[PDB]
Amino acid sequence: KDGKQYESVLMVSIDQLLDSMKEIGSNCLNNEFNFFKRHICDANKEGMFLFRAARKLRQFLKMNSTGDFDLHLLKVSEGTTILLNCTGQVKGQKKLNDLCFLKRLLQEIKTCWNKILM
Amino acid sequence: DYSFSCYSQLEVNGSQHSLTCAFEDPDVNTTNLEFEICGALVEVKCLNFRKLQEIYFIETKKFLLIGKSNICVKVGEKSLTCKKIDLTTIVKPEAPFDLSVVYREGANDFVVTFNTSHLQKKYVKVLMHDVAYRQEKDENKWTHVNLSSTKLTLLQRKLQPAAMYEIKVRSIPDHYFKGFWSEWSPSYYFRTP
Numbered sequence: 226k227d228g229k230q231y232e233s234v235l236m237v238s239i240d241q242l243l244d245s246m247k248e249i250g251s252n253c254l255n256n257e258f259n260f261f262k263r264h265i266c267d268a269n270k271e272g273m274f275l276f277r278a279a280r281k282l283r284q285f286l287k288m289n290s291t292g293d294f295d296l297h298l299l300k301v302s303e304g305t306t307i308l309l310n311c312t313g314q315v316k317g318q319k320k321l322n323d324l325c326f327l328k329r330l331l332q333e334i335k336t337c338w339n340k341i342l343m
Numbered sequence: 344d345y346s347f348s349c350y351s352q353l354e355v356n357g358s359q360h361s362l363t364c365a366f367e368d369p370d371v372n373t374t375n376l377e378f379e380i381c382g383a384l385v386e387v388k389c390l391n392f393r394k395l396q397e398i399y400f401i402e403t404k405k406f407l408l409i410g411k412s413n414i415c416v417k418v419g420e421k422s423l424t425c426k427k428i429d430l431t432t433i434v435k436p437e438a439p440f441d442l443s444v445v446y447r448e449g450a451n452d453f454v455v456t457f458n459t460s461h462l463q464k465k466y467v468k469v470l471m472h473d474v475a476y477r478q479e480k481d482e483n484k485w486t487h488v489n490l491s492s493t494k495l496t497l498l499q500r501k502l503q504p505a506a507m508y509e510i511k512v513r514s515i516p517d518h519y520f521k522g523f524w525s526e527w528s529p530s531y532y533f534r535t536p
């Protein structure tokens with residue numbers, strides 16, 4: 226019960242989101258957005274990456290829609306938010322529409338997680 | 344006393360989950376009671392249970408499934424008894440189906456096979472099945488076999504000959520999620536050579 230809560234639940238939403246985006250690829254591929262430059266998942270305490278990356282996913286939430294897509298976004302965010310305190314490290318904006326970003330964002334959110342777990 | 348239990352069913356209809364609660368002691372007419380749950384939810388903070396006949400329950404996609412959530416019994420506004428539960432621990436799977444036994448005169452055994460809709464799911468995938476079977480002669484004497492796949496085999500010389508057998512299966516969350524047993528799959532009846 227320490228990291229299991231991720232793959233068993235949290236990672237579920239992350240993958241379902243990535244799948245709906247399998248059709249995205251070459252067209253925009255690497256744009257090197259400021260975010261991945263500034264914040265990075267460095268072995269040197271990488272929980273600070275997800276604590277930010279979490280709030281950032283919060284910028285794709287429209288007029289509080291009830292789609293499976295938004296919901297997974299909530300889950301991955303809130304889920305990552307809450308999974309952070311319980312898992313140690315812890316403490317106490319406009320809008321985004323770019324899916325090429327959202328994707329990379331999820332890739333990383335995916336990587337860093339198991340990076341801290343494994 | 345207002346003791347009550349609840350069971351969840353993840354991805355029960357499509358990708359939406361269900362939560363069903365009941366009162367322990369059978370009584371109280373057209374109660375002013377109603378159920379609520381807060382925490383571990385997403386869009387909303389709290390959700391209102393519906394009330395059908397004698398049971399209460401909800402169907403949302405809003406269950407986060409991370410950490411506990413407050414489920415309280417309430418009247419008008421007066422909160423009575425609450426209860427912090429983690430929905431991933433009270434999962435009742437859907438019963439198995441397409442149960443069937445095949446006899447092979449070649450190898451002298453009985454091949455038990457069945458299906459579960461949990462295999463094509465995303466959360467509660469891993470299950471622990473329980474095959475049970477009794478004889479016409481006996482009545483409440485069943486013998487269970489705890490499998491982990493959808494195929495079992497029973498050798499001819501392991502149970503009475505010319506005997507007619509009743510067989511059934513049920514499932515339970517066997518991994519990260521915890522919970523109760525599934526209802527029993529309808530029974531299959533076959534006769535032994």
Ligand SMILES: *[C@@H]1O[C@H](CO)[C@@H](O[C@@H]2O[C@H](CO)[C@@H](O)[C@H](O)[C@H]2NC(C)=O)[C@H](O)[C@H]1NC(C)=O
Binds near residue numbers: 441458459460
């Ligand atoms: C086990 O049961 C499932 C659910 O009923 C079956 O799912 C089939 O899935 C295919 C797509 O891959 C559909 O075209 C079929 O319509 C589904 N079957 C049904 C319900 O008609 C699955 O095939 C079953 N597998 C076994 C071993 O019997």
Ligand SMILES: *[C@@H]1O[C@H](CO)[C@@H](O[C@H]2O[C@H](CO)[C@@H](O)[C@H](O)[C@H]2NC(C)=O)[C@H](O)[C@H]1NC(C)=O
Binds near residue numbers: 376
């Ligand atoms: C069936 O149970 C209900 C309880 O909901 C009884 O209703 C009474 O008790 C309520 C619970 O405290 C109160 O709100 C009221 O005192 C009253 N309800 C009404 C009518 O407002 C009800 O009497 C029971 N059945 C009967 C009629 O015997």
